[PDB]
Symmetry: C2
Subunit: 48 residues, 2 copies
Amino acid sequence: LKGAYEEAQEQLEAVRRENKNLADEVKDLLDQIGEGGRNIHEIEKQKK
Amino acid sequence: LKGAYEEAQEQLEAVRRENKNLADEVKDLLDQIGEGGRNIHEIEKQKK
């Protein structure tokens, strides 16, 4: 297990790394639908 | 040594749960921006 616990430990470092990576990637994609949500209104605004 | 592993195997399972809890939202926002991506391009075809 002394072999197992250390190789498990680095796997926590790998899983945490992608989690905080995508935690950065959820907010900017949320920002993408923000200005894009403004983008659908302004091309509607020129229409009517 | 098992007391860490009993914590870790609970921890690594719980964190990997939060991975796939956010990973589908990466797809769910990807469906969201794509649904606008059909929407923003089809109504602009109506404008022209």
